[model samples]
Target: MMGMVFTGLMELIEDEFGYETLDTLLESCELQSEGIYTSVGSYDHQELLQLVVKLSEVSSVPVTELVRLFGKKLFVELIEGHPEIANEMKDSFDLLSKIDSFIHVEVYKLYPQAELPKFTCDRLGDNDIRLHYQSKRPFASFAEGLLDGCAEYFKEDFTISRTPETQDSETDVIFNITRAPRGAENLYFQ
Candidate 1:
């Protein structure tokens, strides 16, 4: 069925929880970068629950069923489960959780308020998720606006960086932004 996973989710949030509450949580936060959706970490159980609660309120879908559908179901036993790699991760994980708290609302705002398909995203791809505006925003103009918005939110210069898609690149504006230095912390929050 035709649905905007992000848009619909946003409206549903507005409908059930009201705009003030949702927007407040997302307040003082800006896009880590323009048109980029980086995960703070993979969805953890708590984030998953909050999402289900919000989505249930929005979609009127029973939360239990949704959980059963989306939650990892055991097909077989594993000798080594996904191990927590570092003791230091606890702090990072906490930030990620806050990021998760921000994301449900942020994702809605990222895209145009139109119906989107109900497709689950796959992150295994080399390219991360991109929020392409239906009407293209001028690359430079968009970057400027995004930088301003993000600065206002983070109250810091949100460093914008990029990798040239090709050796020979020509563009007025092209870049990537990051909350952290590359390869230092790439784990995503759910």
Candidate 2:
């Protein structure tokens, strides 16, 4: 794992949960760096899991939900940090499709040691896309949050759902995203 992700988590936690809570959570997790992370460094993925677990324990929020929120926050922050990526995409679907094929390549260029999830995307219809995600960590909900954030950013009304293909496997999940019809009641529909 790259420290970029961990650094984002630190920001997310500190911004939402306060520094004291974050410091306490880090101490409770007993991470390798003692919760010190730099965007240009490498880290153990397990440390991230520990932090999330501890955060959930303290906040009384479900771990899955917390991870998903983190994903959404991270996506927004990332785009804000590098607007060129969003500027190149035609829409959310275009952006999502390019994650592995293009964006990940750029990420690797910047952080060669970063380990990222694989996304296999298929266009199911003009308004629908099916994405298969495989990662060593069970963060499917986090992926869903990223998708949701993209849709929101693109100003598109979308409905997303996921199906876990295998139990006891961190690496297999499918996400289905469909654009909702535009109408008077749906400001984001397009």
Candidate 3:
């Protein structure tokens, strides 16, 4: 994994938990870097798993929930770091439809060594898509939260859910997303 994620974890942990809480997490994880990190650096992917494992222990939150929330933050951090990737996005789908094909491709061009997951998006209708996600890491919850972040960023009446898992949900999954109708709620009554 990239230092970008590890570094982001620190900020969220500090903000949500507390500065000293993050310090204790660092100490508990016993990371080789001793909690030192830079956005442009890379480290062992397992180190992140270690940190999150310890964080889960400390916070009493499930790993899935914590990782998912982090994914939401990751989207904002990613967008801020690489504004160019989303420069031409018109909406949520516009950005998401291009993540694997365009955004990741561009990111790969810049960080040739960073390993990225695969998101195979197939448009299903004018307002729906079926996204197949495959990652070597266990981040399905993270992916779901990332989708939530995108939906929120666009302020669209978007709804996302998944089909039942197959074999290992972490390795292979699908998200069924739709821009649900909003006439009942969007009424202009005073």
Candidate 4:
């Protein structure tokens, strides 16, 4: 994974928990960077898993939930860092649909070696979009978080449910996203 991803995770931890807590978790994980990350560098994905696992151990939060929350926070970072790409979408569905065909192509132009997941989105109904995510790494919770973040950003109410298909190798997850009435913000999280 890119160091920028780790950098976002670091900021998310420091912001949600505390710098001290982040330091302790990093020390516990014994990361080669010693928790310091730069956007230009690349690190092993396992380091990220270790940090998430240790953070979960210290915070008493589930690792999957933490990963999901991290995903959401990472989306905010993405918007703030790359508004040119993020601004293209006027709504959540627009953004979700373009992710595989457009956004990932742009990303590859910038970081050719970056391994990214494949997303196949289907417009099932007027208010429904189906998304399939496949990656060598199991981070579907993180994908869910990103979807939630997109809905929150568009200020649209949505319910995203996941069904994981049994795969022998890489992870395959299908998400069913249903949009609700505008005023029902309580259905989703920020």
Candidate 5:
């Protein structure tokens, strides 16, 4: 149950809130992963180097410092002893890898210049759900498909909607299982 709640929160942070802080903190995990996964004999490998360099570049620390931060001795021991952590590391990498896919596959595939599209995210009360989303992107027929993807990531649904040929906002979306949003009045029209 706690895992489900945490998963739901993480999903909100990832899919809805898109919090930069969360992304940044997760990169530390990635940095630890890079050092742990790199083999000593594979010193010539650019791939591992790329990961270290990225961590260094973003954090403004030197690659050598990153290696030091993720100590060589600790790195190998972690990988050898903590297979679960290694699996989590892979999952984190996979999620981080989706930025390009989100831009290319979801946005650009539909609208080439979707850059600077109106984006908004909201949280409703204290239910632990934060909605991270783009408002400019059209809610196409495949919107439900997108919601389906959310179900995989979020334990709860956080879907969006829009009304055509109608003036009423009508929520335009009704996917979240949430309490009323703070500071926003919930209209109950009878």
Candidate 6:
């Protein structure tokens, strides 16, 4: 992962737990970066799993839950970082549909080190969209939260659910996003 991702994770831990807790957590993990990250640097992906595992022990939250929330938080941060992209989208679906054709393509042009997940989005109808995500990393949980944050950011009412190819914590998954019934908005975190 990029240093930017680690920086966001560190910030999330510090903001939610405290600088002291973050310090202790970093000391517990044997990260090559020693928990110091620069936005442009790259680090081992496995180090993130170690940090999240250690963090779950401290926070009493499941690793899956933490990863999901991290993605949500990360999405918000990314939007803030790229105001031009965020504001140009017509809606959540509009933004998602561009992930493969434009967004990830642009990302690779800028950062050749990054390995982006493939997003194949199919608009089944006006109220339904089917999305397939496949990557070398197991981050469907995180992507689930990203999708949630997208709808939330747009103040959109969408119900997003997922099904993986198997029961294991796998990387390949399909997401079905549909318009929510008038009464409530579905929140993946809650």
By TM-score, the best candidate is: 6
Return the candidate ranking by TM-score, descending.
6, 3, 2, 4, 5, 1
Candidate 5 residue pairs that clash: 16-132, 17-132, 161-172
**lDDT, residue 162, model 1:** 49
* Candidate 2 residue-wise lDDT, 1-190, digit = tens: 4567777777777888788888787787656744565676776767667777787778788977776777777777778778787778777766776777888888778767776666677887898888777776665566568778876666666898765456446678667877677665666546
Query: For residues 121-157, what per-residue lDDT tens digits would candidate 1 score against the true structure?
Result: 2232233322222222233333344333434433444
Per candidate, the number of residue pairs that clash is: 12, 0, 0, 0, 3, 0
- Model 4 lDDT per residue over 85-145, tens place: 7778676767766777787787788876787756666787888778766766665566678
Stretch of 10 with least lDDT, candidate 2: 162-171
Candidate 3's TM-score: 0.81
What does candidate 5's lDDT look like per residue over 96-171, in tens digits?
Answer: 2443445335535654433443333444554533333344433343344443343333333333443333323333
TM-score versus the correct structure, for each prediction: 0.22, 0.79, 0.81, 0.78, 0.24, 0.82
lDDT of each: 0.37, 0.73, 0.74, 0.72, 0.39, 0.74
Q: Candidate 5: misplaced stretches above 4 Å?
A: 1-116, 128-137, 153-190
Q: What is the lDDT, from 0 to 100, of the residue 21 in candidate 1? A: 58
Off by over 4 Å in 4: 29-35, 136-139, 163-172, 181-190
Better of 1 and 2 by TM-score: 2
lDDT of 1: 0.37
Give the per-residue lDDT digits (tens) of candidate 6, residues 1-190.
4688878878888988898888878787655645575787776778677787888788788878787778787788888788888776777767776776777778789878877655666779988888776765655566678878877666766787765444355566667878776655555648
Off by over 4 Å in 1: 1-140, 166-175, 178-190
Superposed by TM-score, candidate 3 places the C-alpha of residue 154 at a distance from the truth, in angstroms, of 2.1
Candidate 5, which ten residues in sequence have the lowest lDDT sum? Answer: 1-10
